[PDB]
């Protein structure tokens, strides 16, 4: 067989430098183990300084941080502040008492 | 011999600012006495024909090589002498002798400039230096360290690469054939040539003759050739010849423009030990870029 | 910090010079101020690495393999060259400063004749000499060295390098000068010296060779040039060879008691 | 700020073995010291001594002076090494396995 | 003093990092400071740090943050591999080239304000770069200079209107050109990021001069050969580049016409061969990246 | 940022089941393959031939294969050996 699975082979991005352990397997383990959804908070409003509270009336932003049947996340989920965690549960109770989400 | 006989170098009188009277005697005049004697000792057509001749005809023969050793570091030295006029710098035997203490001092090669060739008028010379080494910084940086990097004896030289890798009716108009794509530094070590027309190849040629003499040794012992002979010596004359090829075809050859002689012989004397570097500073501050711009080729505007 | 040795007799060697060989002048260029060079450069190259530690013929032997330390190696060869061409050539290796002794009359011993004799065909050593002065002169156009070496084969050999060419390790001999154009014989030693090198199994690219140099000739322009002359290289190595000390040479040729 | 200005000055290993800190004789006025490589800390102390002396009175005119005698010096030494390599290849020297061919060895 | 040494000491030169030693994402250049041992410290343990390094660590490079931490041992990774990167980069002798021609940033160049004509596009940069700012320390960038530059409004209510006169009874197109020109002429007397913090030029990877040719015994080297190896079997998704591994760096490897079937047969262990490459040119980008363009030589 | 959680000073640091990686058995895989082949093809079909001969070799002396990677895991003796280093208790 000439294919393998993408999750046993390591796509090296162009211009970076690597060493011949990013050839083996405990690099892809490693990446495994350390793979964590650290870029959110560049694309996560609710982590940059707005107020969770002024987005009661966006329910596209607030949908974002509810579960597929609207269960809020907990805030190990989330990973905000815990004031942010505190608006954005209140943006979120709010908006589900206007009719929007 | 005057055959190898420069105007601005007058024995008895020295080159003021880079070599004394001395300096210039051992340098020059008792230098091109000897290796003119070995030339005429071991070719008798020495007189006959001219240095670049017997150095592109006894080429890539060893038999001939003591003939082009001498013949080629007569022209290397001739080359390297023709473009210094001096400098209004202190007389090389009036200063004192760098000890020690120069090895740790800073060079400045990349702050100031000195000596360009603008300044002279040579200003086609000077836009070919920037296009092809971006800064008159650049090129002075690039080529003093160069030299200063060769241990023993050899040149450093500013080239000019021929834009006439056709090798159709190559050498039949001076100036269709005189044209020059880009210039380049390169280094010669002991009696090496700068053109590399006449040497380029003599390893692969070497290569393949004793892969062929080994490989009908082998018919006779009789054996099925290798699993990775035929492989390894395949690669080593891939590489070979993808190493030497020029941008179209496989003649690359170069136009000597100026040469910085780097032997001991010529800067050992003034200088000492410890001021090779001061050699070379005062070497820049001493060439006549009139004779550089001259010897460069028209641009090949193929662009 | 690498420092330049102290030579025994120094305050002769800085008034007198080497005698038969050498003036004060010639003496001070090539050791007080050349080895100051080597040094001075080498310690700047290695400083703040573990090759400090190391004396320079270790270095250049842990560095011979290494492409891009070639400037280090160059600088540990000639330092280690250096000192044992100003070794066999110095007068006494004693320090006879306070006993002032003025008669050293140092003869090849009878191992050396005798290794002399199995090694050139019963060729004498003044017949050796005229040999070694004539592949000095035809194998080195520029700066080098000319060693007479002893192999693992108790045969001594003549050995010449380019530059900073080290005798002990082959690879590094730098005896061809692949400037000019070079006979297929040359180009056979040369193609046989990489396939050693690739029998090798060690992942430095490594070979064994135990030669070991026995007499030093410096062929360096810092070594003749004032006092003899562009030109007049085989009157100095002429010279260097008739004057030779052979206490230190004798005690190079290993013995066995 | 030197080693956010250049990330590949930290590729040059160092050595935090210390030999003998009392016997560090440097004379500033340069840059290049007997006994210890030309490095970062090269770069620094070259900037102290300026702005001790008075030559530069801000900081950062006396370290941009610093960093160009840093380039040149690191620039002579470029080319020593491309050259003794190229020189040594020009008479005969062979090297079993180089730094490309170690890395596609691993 | 005491204080006087520590500064100069081995580890005062080691500039303080507490990046993770264990980065999974793009690595572009060096992140920690690689530390040598010699042999004979090595065989003792030392290494110049607080603490002994275990003794099953073999290597003689390693790479750390902190000297010692609450669950007392030495944070480092034994591993020194970055300057086998720099090294092989040096042994392929491809100079880095500016793909925008700029001066060269190794060599005190007289510049002049040709680029200077774009004062109103950074002097606002300096509240405008705030790409990663906090919000409300971003917003302290609004009060704090606020004041500061209405503390000149006397100093441009008097040369304006002694200088520029007919602008201040006419338009303002050409005030706004006075104020831009205004600050900035009294800001480059102040030190706002007098300290620029991004990579110059190369960043220290090479400081070869590109220039000079390669002599050989088979004459001048004209394209430079370097084994590598093919990442992926199909071309970049999006990009008509393939992929390459060369000397520790990752390579956009043009094909001269086609690419060779020794793709299509081996597949996704493309990798596990070695090829020769010729490299084009290299670049350095912003990010502190190398952009390495190479050549698939076959054996033709 | 990110929530650290220290625990307090316990009797021991013990994982009551430590995790290990069990090998498949090379003969049941194949015994797995060529029933899935007969399920497909049919039994005794000739396309499972070479899967009949390798489950025969894989089975020959022991229906299992020579089974040798038993391993048992470390943790619990690392753990209690480093426990005491790295807990980051204060002194007494």
Same mark, same amino acid.
Request: charged share 25%; glycine share 6%.
């Given at each position: 067989?000439?294919?393998?699975?993408?999750?046993?082979?390591?796509?090296?991005?162009?211009?970076?430098?690597?060493?011949?352990?990013?050839?083996?397997? $405990?690099?892809?383990?490693?990446?495994?183990?350390?793979?964590?959804?650290?870029?959110?908070?560049?694309?996560?409003?609710?982590?940059? $300084?707005?107020?969770?509270?002024?987005?009661?009336?966006?329910?596209?932003?607030?949908?974002?941080?509810?579960?597929?049947? $609207?269960?809020?996340?907990?805030?190990?989920?989330? $990973?905000?502040?815990?004031?942010?965690?505190?608006?954005?549960?209140?943006?979120?109770?709010?908006?589900?008492?206007?009719?929007?989400? | 011999?005057?055959?190898?006989?420069?105007?601005?170098?007058?024995?008895?009188?020295?080159?003021?600012?880079?070599?004394?009277?001395?300096?210039?005697?051992?340098?020059?005049?008792?230098?091109?006495?000897?290796?003119?004697?070995?030339?005429?000792?071991?070719?008798?057509?020495?007189?006959?024909?001219?240095?670049?001749?017997?150095?592109?005809?006894?080429?890539?023969?060893?038999?001939?090589?003591?003939? *082009?050793?001498?013949?080629?570091?007569? %022209?290397?030295?001739?080359?390297?002498?023709?473009?210094?006029?001096?400098?209004?710098?202190?007389?090389?035997?009036?200063?004192?002798?760098?000890?020690?203490?120069?090895?740790?001092?800073?060079?400045?090669?990349?702050?100031?400039?000195?000596?360009?060739?603008?300044?002279?008028?040579?200003?086609?010379?000077?836009?070919?230096?920037?296009?092809?080494?971006?800064?008159?910084?650049?090129?002075?940086?690039?080529?003093?360290?160069?030299?200063?990097?060769?241990?023993?004896?050899?040149?450093?030289?500013?080239?000019?690469?021929?834009?006439?890798?056709?090798?159709?009716?190559?050498?039949?108009?001076?100036?269709?054939?005189?044209?020059?794509?880009?210039?380049?530094?390169?280094?010669?070590?002991?009696?090496?040539?700068?053109?590399?027309?006449?040497?380029?190849?003599?390893?692969?040629?070497?290569?393949?003759?004793?892969?062929?003499?080994?490989?009908?040794?082998?018919?006779?012992?009789?054996?099925?050739?290798?699993?990775?002979?035929?492989?390894?010596?395949?690669?080593?004359?891939?590489?070979?010849?993808?190493?030497?090829?020029?941008?179209?075809?496989?003649? *690359?050859?170069?136009?000597?423009?100026?040469?910085?002689?780097?032997?001991?012989?010529?800067?050992?004397?003034?200088?000492?030990?410890?001021?090779?570097?001061? %050699?070379?500073?005062? *070497?820049?501050?001493?060439?006549?870029?009139?004779? *550089?711009?001259?010897?460069?080729?028209?641009?090949?505007?193929?662009? | 910090?690498? =420092?330049?040795?102290?030579?025994?007799?120094?305050?002769?060697?800085?008034?007198?010079?080497? !005698?038969?060989?050498?003036?004060?002048?010639?003496?001070?260029?090539?050791?007080?101020?050349?080895?100051?060079?080597?040094?001075?450069?080498?310690?700047?190259?290695?400083?703040?690495?573990?090759?400090?530690?190391?004396?320079?013929?270790?270095?250049?032997?842990?560095?011979?393999?290494?492409?891009?330390?070639?400037?280090?190696?160059?600088?540990?060869?000639?330092?280690?060259?250096?000192?044992?061409? =100003?070794?066999?050539?110095? !007068?006494?290796?004693?320090?006879?400063?306070?006993?002032?002794?003025?008669?050293?009359?140092?003869?090849?011993?009878?191992?050396?004749?005798?290794?002399?004799?199995?090694?050139?065909?019963?060729?004498?050593?003044?017949?050796?000499?005229?040999?070694?002065?004539?592949?000095?002169?035809?194998?080195?156009?520029?700066?080098?060295?000319?060693?007479?070496?002893?192999?693992?084969?108790?045969?001594?050999?003549?050995?010449?390098?380019?530059?900073?060419?080290?005798?002990?390790?082959? !690879?590094?001999?730098?005896?061809?000068?692949?400037?000019?154009?070079?006979?297929?014989?040359?180009?056979?030693?040369?193609?046989?010296?990489?396939?050693?090198?690739?029998?090798?199994?060690?992942?430095?690219?490594?070979?064994?060779?135990?030669?070991?140099?026995?007499?030093?000739?410096?062929?360096?322009?810092?070594?003749?040039?004032?006092?003899?002359?562009?030109?007049?290289?085989?009157?100095?190595?002429?010279? =260097?060879?008739?004057?030779?000390?052979?206490?230190? =040479?004798?005690?190079?040729?290993?013995?066995?008691? | 700020?030197?080693?956010?200005?250049?990330?590949?000055?930290?590729? /040059?290993?160092?050595?935090?073995?210390?030999?003998?800190?009392?016997?560090?004789?440097?004379?500033?006025?340069?840059?290049?010291?007997?006994?210890?490589?030309?490095?970062?800390?090269?770069?620094?102390?070259?900037?102290?001594?300026?702005?001790?002396?008075?030559?530069?009175?801000?900081?950062?005119?006396?370290?941009?002076?610093? /960093?160009?005698?840093?380039?040149?010096?690191?620039?002579?030494?470029?080319?020593?090494?491309?050259?003794?390599?190229?020189?040594?290849?020009?008479?005969?020297?062979?090297?079993?396995?180089?730094?490309?061919?170690?890395?596609?060895?691993? | 003093?005491?204080?006087?040494?520590?500064?100069?000491?081995?580890?005062?030169?080691?500039? &303080?990092?507490?990046?993770?030693?264990?980065?999974?994402?793009?690595?572009?250049?060096?992140?920690?400071?690689?530390?040598?041992?010699?042999?004979?410290?090595?065989? +003792?343990?030392?290494?110049?740090?607080?603490?002994?390094?275990?003794?099953?660590?073999?290597?003689?490079?390693?790479?750390?943050?902190?000297?010692?931490?609450?669950?007392?041992?030495?944070?480092?990774?034994?591993?020194?591999?970055?300057?086998?990167? +720099?090294?092989?980069?040096?042994?392929?002798?491809?100079?880095?080239?500016?793909?925008?021609?700029?001066?060269?940033?190794?060599?005190?160049?007289?510049?002049?304000?040709?680029?200077?004509?774009?004062?109103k596009?950074?002097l606002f940069?300096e509240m405008?770069?705030?790409?990663?700012?906090?919000?409300?320390?971003?917003?302290?960038r609004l009060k704090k200079i606020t004041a500061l530059i209405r503390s000149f409004q006397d100093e441009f209510k008097?040369?304006?209107?002694?200088?520029?006169?007919?602008?201040?009874?006419? &338009?303002?197109?050409?005030?706004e050109?006075?104020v831009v020109k205004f600050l900035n002429k009294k800001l480059?007397?102040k030190?706002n990021?007098?300290?620029?913090?991004?990579?110059?030029?190369?960043?220290?990877?090479?400081?070869?001069?590109?220039?000079?040719?390669?002599?050989?015994?088979?004459?001048?080297?004209?394209?430079?050969?370097?084994?590598? +190896?093919?990442?992926?079997?199909?071309?970049?998704? &999006?990009?008509?580049?393939?992929?390459?591994?060369?000397?520790?760096?990752?390579?956009?490897?043009?094909?001269?016409?086609?690419?060779?079937?020794?793709?299509?047969?081996?597949?996704?262990?493309? +990798?596990?061969?070695?090829?020769?490459?010729?490299?084009?040119?290299?670049?350095?980008?912003?990010?502190?990246?190398?952009?390495?363009?190479?050549?698939?030589?076959?054996?033709? | 940022?990110?929530?650290?959680?220290? #625990?307090?000073? #316990?009797?021991?640091?013990? @994982?009551?089941?430590?995790?290990?990686?069990?090998?498949?058995?090379?003969?049941? @895989? #194949?015994?797995?393959?060529? #029933?899935?082949?007969?399920?497909?093809?049919?039994?005794?079909?000739?396309?499972?031939?070479?899967? @009949?001969?390798?489950?025969?070799?894989?089975?020959?002396?022991?229906?299992?294969?020579?089974?040798?990677?038993?391993?048992?895991?470390?943790?619990?003796?690392?753990?209690?050996?480093?426990?005491?280093?790295?807990?980051?208790?204060?002194?007494?």
């Open positions: 067989t000439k294919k393998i699975d993408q999750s046993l082979s390591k796509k090296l991005p162009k211009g970076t430098i690597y060493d011949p352990f990013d050839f083996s397997m $405990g690099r892809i383990h490693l990446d495994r183990k350390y793979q964590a959804n650290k870029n959110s908070n560049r694309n996560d409003i609710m982590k940059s $300084g707005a107020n969770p509270l002024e987005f009661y009336a966006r329910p596209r932003i607030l949908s974002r941080y509810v579960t597929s049947t $609207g269960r809020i996340q907990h805030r190990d989920i989330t $990973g905000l502040s815990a004031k942010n965690q505190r608006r954005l549960s209140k943006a979120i109770r709010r908006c589900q008492a206007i009719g929007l989400m | 011999s005057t055959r190898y006989a420069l105007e601005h170098l007058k024995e008895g009188a020295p080159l003021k600012g880079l070599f004394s009277i001395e300096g210039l005697q051992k340098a020059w005049f008792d230098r091109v006495k000897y290796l003119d004697a070995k030339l005429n000792d071991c070719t008798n057509e020495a007189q006959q024909k001219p240095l670049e001749t017997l150095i592109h005809e006894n080429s890539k023969s060893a038999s001939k090589k003591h003939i *082009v050793n001498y013949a080629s570091s007569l %022209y290397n030295l001739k080359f390297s002498m023709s473009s210094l006029q001096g400098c209004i710098r202190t007389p090389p035997e009036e200063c004192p002798r760098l000890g020690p203490e120069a090895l740790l001092q800073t060079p400045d090669f990349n702050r100031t400039i000195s000596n360009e060739p603008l300044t002279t008028g040579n200003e086609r010379l000077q836009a070919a230096l920037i296009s092809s080494f971006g800064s008159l910084m650049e090129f002075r940086t690039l080529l003093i360290n160069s030299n200063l990097a060769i241990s023993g004896d050899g040149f450093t030289w500013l080239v000019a690469r021929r834009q006439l890798d056709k090798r159709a009716m190559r050498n039949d108009m001076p100036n269709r054939d005189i044209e020059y794509d880009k210039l380049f530094i390169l280094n010669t070590y002991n009696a090496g040539t700068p053109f590399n027309f006449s040497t380029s190849g003599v390893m692969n040629e070497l290569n393949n003759q004793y892969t062929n003499m080994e490989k009908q040794r082998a018919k006779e012992a009789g054996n099925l050739e290798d699993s990775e002979m035929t492989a390894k010596q395949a690669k080593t004359k891939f590489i070979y010849e993808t190493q030497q090829k020029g941008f179209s075809g496989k003649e *690359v050859s170069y136009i000597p423009l100026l040469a910085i002689d780097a032997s001991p012989k010529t800067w050992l004397t003034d200088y000492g030990v410890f001021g090779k570097r001061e %050699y070379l500073e005062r *070497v820049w501050d001493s060439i006549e870029w009139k004779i *550089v711009e001259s010897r460069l080729p028209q641009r090949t505007k193929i662009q | 910090i690498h =420092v330049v040795p102290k030579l025994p007799n120094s305050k002769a060697l800085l008034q007198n010079g080497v !005698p038969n060989i050498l003036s004060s002048s010639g003496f001070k260029t090539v050791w007080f101020d050349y080895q100051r060079y080597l040094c001075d450069k080498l310690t700047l190259a290695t400083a703040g690495q573990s090759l400090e530690s190391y004396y320079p013929f270790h270095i250049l032997l842990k560095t011979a393999g290494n492409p891009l330390q070639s400037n280090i190696f160059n600088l540990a060869s000639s330092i280690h060259n250096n000192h044992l061409f =100003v070794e066999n050539i110095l !007068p006494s290796a004693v320090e006879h400063g306070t006993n002032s002794n003025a008669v050293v009359k140092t003869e090849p011993s009878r191992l050396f004749l005798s290794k002399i004799k199995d090694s050139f065909n019963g060729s004498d050593w003044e017949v050796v000499k005229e040999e070694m002065i004539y592949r000095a002169e035809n194998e080195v156009l520029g700066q080098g060295w000319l060693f007479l070496v002893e192999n693992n084969e108790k045969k001594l050999f003549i050995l010449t390098s380019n530059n900073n060419g080290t005798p002990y390790y082959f !690879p590094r001999n730098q005896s061809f000068d692949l400037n000019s154009a070079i006979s297929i014989d040359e180009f056979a030693t040369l193609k046989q010296m990489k396939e050693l090198i690739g029998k090798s199994t060690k992942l430095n690219g490594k070979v064994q060779d135990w030669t070991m140099p026995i007499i030093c000739v410096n062929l360096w322009d810092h070594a003749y040039l004032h006092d003899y002359g562009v030109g007049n290289r085989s009157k100095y190595v002429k010279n =260097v060879l008739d004057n030779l000390n052979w206490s230190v =040479v004798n005690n190079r040729i290993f013995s066995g008691i | 700020l030197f080693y956010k200005q250049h990330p590949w000055e930290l590729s /040059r290993p160092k050595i935090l073995v210390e030999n003998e800190i009392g016997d560090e004789n440097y004379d500033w006025s340069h840059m290049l010291q007997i006994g210890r490589p030309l490095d970062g800390e090269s770069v620094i102390q070259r900037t102290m001594y300026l702005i001790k002396t008075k030559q530069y009175g801000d900081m950062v005119e006396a370290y941009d002076h610093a /960093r160009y005698e840093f380039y040149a010096l690191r620039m002579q030494e470029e080319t020593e090494q491309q050259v003794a390599l190229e020189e040594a290849e020009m008479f005969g020297s062979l090297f079993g396995v180089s730094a490309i061919e170690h890395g596609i060895q691993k | 003093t005491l204080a006087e040494l520590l500064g100069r000491s081995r580890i005062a030169q080691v500039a &303080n990092n507490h990046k993770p030693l264990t980065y999974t994402g793009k690595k572009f250049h060096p992140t920690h400071q690689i530390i040598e041992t010699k042999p004979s410290t090595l065989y +003792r343990q030392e290494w110049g740090l607080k603490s002994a390094i275990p003794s099953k660590i073999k290597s003689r490079y390693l790479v750390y943050n902190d000297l010692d931490t609450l669950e007392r041992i030495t944070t480092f990774e034994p591993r020194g591999g970055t300057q086998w990167n +720099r090294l092989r980069f040096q042994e392929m002798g491809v100079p880095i080239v500016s793909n925008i021609g700029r001066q060269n940033p190794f060599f005190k160049y007289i510049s002049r304000p040709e680029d200077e004509s774009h004062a596009l950074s940069k405008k770069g705030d790409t990663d700012i906090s919000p409300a320390a971003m917003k302290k008097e040369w304006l209107v002694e200088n520029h006169p007919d602008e201040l009874k006419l &338009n303002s197109n050409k005030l050109d006075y480059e007397t030190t990021k007098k300290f620029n913090t991004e990579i110059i030029g190369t960043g220290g990877l090479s400081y070869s001069l590109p220039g000079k040719l390669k002599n050989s015994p088979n004459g001048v080297i004209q394209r430079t050969v370097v084994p590598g +190896r093919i990442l992926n079997v199909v071309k970049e998704n &999006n990009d008509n580049k393939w992929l390459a591994a060369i000397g520790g760096f990752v390579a956009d490897v043009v094909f001269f016409q086609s690419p060779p079937s020794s793709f299509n047969s081996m597949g996704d262990f493309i +990798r596990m061969k070695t090829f020769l490459f010729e490299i084009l040119e290299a670049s350095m980008e912003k990010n502190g990246s190398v952009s390495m363009h190479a050549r698939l030589l076959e054996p033709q | 940022k990110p929530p650290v959680y220290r #625990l307090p000073p #316990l009797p021991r640091l013990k @994982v009551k089941k430590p995790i290990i990686r069990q090998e498949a058995n090379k003969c049941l @895989v #194949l015994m797995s393959n060529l #029933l899935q082949c007969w399920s497909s093809y049919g039994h005794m079909s000739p396309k499972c031939a070479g899967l @009949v001969t390798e489950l025969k070799s894989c089975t020959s002396e022991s229906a299992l294969g020579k089974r040798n990677n038993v391993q048992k895991s470390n943790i619990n003796y690392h753990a209690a050996r480093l426990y005491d280093r790295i807990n980051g208790k204060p002194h007494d």
